[PDB]
Structure formats: C-alpha cells, structure tokens
Amino acid sequence: MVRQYKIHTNLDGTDDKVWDVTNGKVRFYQPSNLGLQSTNNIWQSNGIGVMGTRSITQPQIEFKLETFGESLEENYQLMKDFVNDILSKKFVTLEYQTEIFQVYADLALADVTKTEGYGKNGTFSEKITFDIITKWYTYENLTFDKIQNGKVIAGMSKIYGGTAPGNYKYIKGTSYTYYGESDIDRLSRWDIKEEIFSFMGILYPKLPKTPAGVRFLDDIGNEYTAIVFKTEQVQDYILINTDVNDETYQGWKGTTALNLFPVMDFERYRTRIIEKGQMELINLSKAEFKIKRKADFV
C-alpha cells in the first residue's frame, strides 16, 4: 500500500546491512525532489526552434532525518550508528518501493546535521542531504531460456509412416514441418532485451587453462565485448561485478579469494554497456546473473 524507503550499506553483497527509514527507529520523511531537471540546449533562429541534446540532470535529495528513541542515550547511539554506517561504505544504495515498482538509487552523503533542539526523551529532527550517483535503476535476476522440441503429428511432420516403406505427403499449408532437432538441449539463450549498464555475475568454470568467462553478441551475431579469464587451476567460481564504483573480478577456490584482473583478456573487454542481443558462456558449467538497468523518472 504505502511506500517503503530502505538504506543499504552494500547491496549485491554478503556484508549487507539494511536500515528501514520508513518503519525503523531512524526515519526519512518528506523527500525534497524525486523528479528531474532537463537542459535541452534549445536555440531559436527567427521564430523557428532548433533543439540540441537533452542532459537529464539529477538533483540532491534532502530528507528529514528523525529518530525515535526511549532515552537520550538511545538517540545519540542512533545518530552515531546510522551516519558512520553511511560513511563506512563509499556509497549507499537507497531503495524506493511502492505498490507498482521497486527502484534503487546510488547515493553519497552530501550533508548531515546535528543540533541541540531535542524533543521528548532526546529525539533528533535533522536534514540529511544526498548526492546522486545514479538515479533509479532496476536490480533484477537474469536467466537463460530453454528450447523444447515440437510434437510429432502424422501427415504434418517429416516421417516415413503408415504403409511400408513409409510416406510423407506434400500438401498446401499443412504439408511437412520438421518436429524439432536431435539434441535440442544444446540450445540456450541468455536474452538481453533492453540496454543494461552494470551486472553481478557468479560464474562456475569447467576446464582449467582454457579461457573461462562470458561474451556478448549483438542483434546480428557479432561480439562487441567479453569478460574472459585464463586461470591455472579450476576456480570453484569467478565472482564478477561490472559496477564502476567498486569493480570486482575475483576468483574463489575453497575459502581463498584471488584477484583475477591481470589474468583477464583486455582486448575482448571493449565495453561495460551491454546492448540488445544475447550472451554466451565460455568454458562455464553454470552461471548466475543479476542485471541492473537504469530508468530516469519513476
């Protein structure tokens, strides 16, 4: 029904800590602006209007930080905790949730205020300003699609049936349609329908010393970028994060974490921006993907 705001220390990560700024002890109220400012570069010559390129500018969100605590000790402990937790991580992801959507914004602490105007049992009523890194993006699960063989029908499918030594008839419209393909289980498509900007993939390699990773193809079947690694031993999994702010390319074997950046193929990795098409798995047995895609206004 009502909206939900949730501050995350590290989303997409094991060391995550979530603060409910809607229901918890420390709450965010009356956001300054959730919209957007656009600058279209319009120049008019003799009454006729010419439009350039629109630079969609995102403005600082200023909240109304309010703590609810049983004692003065409790609210001072809340301010020291919530702020340090935002300061501890270089950037904090604010989740925007409503009946219809679940968007996210990457924020950086711009300004926080601490004053001595306490209410009852020493309760804070302050202004918390944030700088926009990325405004509104959808964090969703990306999975491959499987292809299944069509059913075999007498007269419709290519088979030599009925009276010996078989018969298939050329009709008009119904004629002969191939049932499927021998070993249809080989075909798998990791479909990309809209342009994505960053992702958190968990890749499980097959063979050691053979380049292992992912490659991306466009609408015409041409490779534009590829994250691939040539390791000496089989890693249990290669944890990759394409996020610009905290780029991670690490391999895991047992309880040991290895940085795989120098072993990576630098020539194939041309871009981070993934375009409309499909994704292929190079020397991978299994893969788990989480795709984050931007939305200007939500």
Binding site: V244, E247, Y249, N259, F261, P262, F266, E267, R270
Partner: protein
Amino acid sequence: MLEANVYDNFNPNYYNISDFSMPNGKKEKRGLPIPKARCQVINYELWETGYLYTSSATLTVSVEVGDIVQILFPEVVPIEEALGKKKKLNLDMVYLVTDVDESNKATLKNYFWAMIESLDVPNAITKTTNFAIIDYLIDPNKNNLMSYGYFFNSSIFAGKATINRKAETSSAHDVAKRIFSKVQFQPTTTIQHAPSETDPRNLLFINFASRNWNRKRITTRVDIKQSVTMDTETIVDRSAYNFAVVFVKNKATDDYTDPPKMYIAKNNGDVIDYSTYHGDGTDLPDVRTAKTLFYDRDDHGNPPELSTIKVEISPSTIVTRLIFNQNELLPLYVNDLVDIWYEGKLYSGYIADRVKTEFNDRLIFVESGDKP
C-alpha cells in the same frame, strides 16, 4: 598529509669540496645537511619525474626560493642496480623551490631538470653511446645543484645515441628529452644515507634504475571511468606542409622565370612529382597541407635532389598521450613498458610521470610509436 624535509640550497660551491674526514681517516665530499625545519606538505600536486607539468604545494613552514624540499613516504622502492643486486631504497620526491606566493604556495621543480639547467652540449659528445651523455650531464663540477652518484640500468642506455639535427649545439634539456623518448625512461632524484655503515653521510643520487634489470612489456586496459585525458605529442621534428610548390631559379636570367614543379607525398612515405601521378587518390592524403619553397641552383647547375625536398615534406611522429587515474586492480608505476587498450584501440608505450595529489593518483602514458 605527507611529511616534508626542508633544506637550504644544495650549493655545489660548498658541498663539492672533499675535505670531510671519514671515520677510517680518508678524505671525502661534504655530506648533505639536516633539515632546517620539518614541515608537512599540504594542498599538493606532486609529480614523480616532471615530464609535462611542474609540481605545486603549500607548506606549513615559510620556505624561500632556492630551498630543497624532500617529500617522504612510508614505503620502499627496490631498484635493480646490478643483474642480481637489488637495493633497499626509500620512497622520495625531491624538488627545488622556484617561487613562493603570498599564501605560501611553493612552485616545485623536479631536482634533476633543475640540475641540468642552462647546460649546453655540442654534437661531438652526442656522437658516442647514451652512457657518455648521462656521465657528462650528471656532474657536480658543472651543474647548478649538488650531485653525489648516479644509478643506471646498463641495458636501457646500451644503444647508440639518437642522431642530432644540423649537428648543432643543443641544451641539456632538449637532448635528455630526445634520449628519454627513445630509451622509454624518466629520471627520479632520491635522498638516502650512504651504503657503507662506516660512512655517516646523507647523500643525493639520480635514479635511472628499474624494479626489473631486464624490463618486460605489460598488457593492460584503461576504461573511460578513470577521467582519461587524450592529447597528441610529437617526438621527432619533421615538417607540416605535405605538398610542395617548388621553384627553381633560371641560370640565364638569374631569376625564378621558369614555372614551378609540384611535389606530393604518398600515404606510404614516398615523394613524387604531382604531374607524374596516375592513380585514383586512395594512395594520397585526406587533406592537402601546402607550402611554397625557393631553391638556389648548385655550383654544378643541376636541380635540387628529390630526397632533399622529401626531408622537408616528410611526416612527424604523431604520438598519443594518456593521463588517467591509478587502477588498484592492475597498478602501473613509473618506468614500466606497457600496452594500453583504450576505447577499442591499442596504444603502446611507457609510464613517464605520476601525480600524488590529495584527491587522486594519476599516470602519464607516452606512446613510443614505432608501430609498423
């Protein structure tokens, strides 16, 4: 902040004298003094070699023009001075104060380039190997600033020295720049206590050594996110008007009465007469840069050689420079041979400089050229 040691000018008119009595009894050169004041360098832009820009930093103590500033880092750099011999050297950034403003912001010039100042070198010295030029340039008997020793990687400066234009007298700055471009190396000045435990002197040396004696080429990628600055440099000086309207003076009139002969440079590098061309324009340049040249007939009377005209219309070394943030996934330090991938294009060269600022850590990449 960083720690800074402020010393008065390392005057070679004082420190070059070999009157200091060593503990054994021997008479050696005067050692460097103790810092007149220990301060902290703040609001800084500090380069490692000073390849392109001059350093600038505000200092807590009121330093004056001439003073030497030694910026300290709690880390160590291992230089390979011999094939197997690697020595424990402390990280230092040594500069000379060139000017201080009202707000005590000092303009710092890298010690080496401030040492080889006003020094001129004739073509005669440049005829030998690069070792001979380095041994000439680094001398406390000649230089404006005091020098004690030089560390140099023999393999990188083993090659024959670059050929000088017109065989003229060049400045120590121009020759060093020309040499450092071909060898793909940059110098770093370092203050460190004498190697022997008996010798108690603090000394200043120039570094031409690397972490690897036999330097290896690295292959890396530079993303647009690292605030990349692309600009084109020129290593070799060659002329810019690719087309030449050449005039030849008539012997009988002692005048330029005869019409001109036009010469065009092909994409391959060869120079032909424009009239002789029979092609489709694919082998010719995309833009015609032109100049009018006047020549005087030789004593023999023959027209000037095609080759002599060719040198004047010949292309200059178009080189790409990349300044970007330090990647912690694959760190790139100064004096490293690298092959950088940027926006789908491969650029090959070395890391010339490194800026140690309060906000970022950046690198200057210089594409050495020599691609085909």
